[PDB]
Amino acid sequence: PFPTLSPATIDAINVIGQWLAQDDFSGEVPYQADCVILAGNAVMPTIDAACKIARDQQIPLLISGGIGHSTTFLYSAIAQHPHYNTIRTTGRAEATILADIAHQFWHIPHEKIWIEDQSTNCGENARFSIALLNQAVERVHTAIVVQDPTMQRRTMATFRRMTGDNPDAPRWLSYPGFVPQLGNNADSVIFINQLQGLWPVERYLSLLTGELPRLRDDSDGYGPRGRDFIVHVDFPAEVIHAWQTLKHDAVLIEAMESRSL
Incomplete structure (x- = not known):
């Protein structure tokens, strides 16, 4: 031990x-957003936090993650999970697997799940999520970013490198769970x-x-x-x-x- x-x-x-x-930057602004971004990770409480918000607020859930450092951890975390063990893992992208949790277990409709399944690291999770958001139908002004608590700070600073942000009106909110x-x-x-x-x-x-x-x-x-x-x-x-x-x-x-x- x-x-x-x-x-x-x-x-x-x-x-x-x-x-x-x-996240100090966004302080304690209420978590009312136009979209929730789940950055690929293996921490099931975090992954469930993302799904729960998208479900409860009835907003789009954008799931970002292809193959990188956390992929094999995610595979293990699914396999030991008492409900999610039915989800196929090996060989699939992170976001594909996480979409099965969102849809199969949290009952989020397909039309509300956006899958970004090609990013290989934090910088690409953010860059590619921004690319998809910028293609938006209904324009997104505020997004809640959900990441493994250890990597939350890095992830928010990555998103903010790409777009900047306003401390009086943050567009990126942070909720690791x-x-x-x-x-x-x-x-x-x-x-x-x-x-x-x-x-x-x-x-x-x-x-x-x-x-x-x-x-x-x-x-x-x-x-x-x-x-x-x-x-x-x-x-x-x-x-x-x-x-x-x-x-x-x-x-x-x-x-x-x-x-x-």
């Missing part, structure tokens, strides 16, 4: 988790969110820690001073402290490097 961690380290992980999940939180229990670390289908802690920590150098606006990052894939990200001082706390935690490094991430 994944080892127990110091309270300081738990706190730090939770600070960075919160920041990656919670939940704010991931860890805690110690019985000689191990567990999620405190009472949700099925979450990453193994080791995988969540690999993702969470993989995002930070991408977000960091230096020559090695995805920002304007690096690859120029995303807008400049300003790191809060609390997040920097949290990231240093992780980098200095020997128990944590040992756990993360001796295991499957």
Whole structure:
């Protein structure tokens, strides 16, 4: 089992988790939109959040994802799901599989599901979703973007690199579905969110820690001073402290490097 961690380290992980999940830019604008965009991922609570909104608001659901890094995770996440195991996986694009959940299980009509099944990474999820939105029949002014909580911040900064946005009137709203939180229990670390289908802690920590150098606006990052894939990200001082706390935690490094991430 994944080892127990110091309270300081738990706190730090939770600070960075919160920041990656919670979009500051759009603050707390109500989630009333013209379309919901589900970026390809494997986190079933997130995927269900997208379907639930499109269902409840009776708006179009645009599902974006072809084949890339998260595809085989999605395949596994379907196969272990107590209801969605009936959906065929191997060899299909992400968005095709996710449309089966939307239609077969959430009863969203075909005419309300738009499938973008060719993107191979975050930049293409966003670029290709924008391309499809720009072809719109009924013009889209506001869209809710639903992504794995660890990659939410990157994804919103990718969309915003492409179109810009207005802080007084955000066109891109952010709803990963939940704010991931860890805690110690019985000689191990567990999620405190009472949700099925979450990453193994080791995988969540690999993702969470993989995002930070991408977000960091230096020559090695995805920002304007690096690859120029995303807008400049300003790191809060609390997040920097949290990231240093992780980098200095020997128990944590040992756990993360001796295991499957």
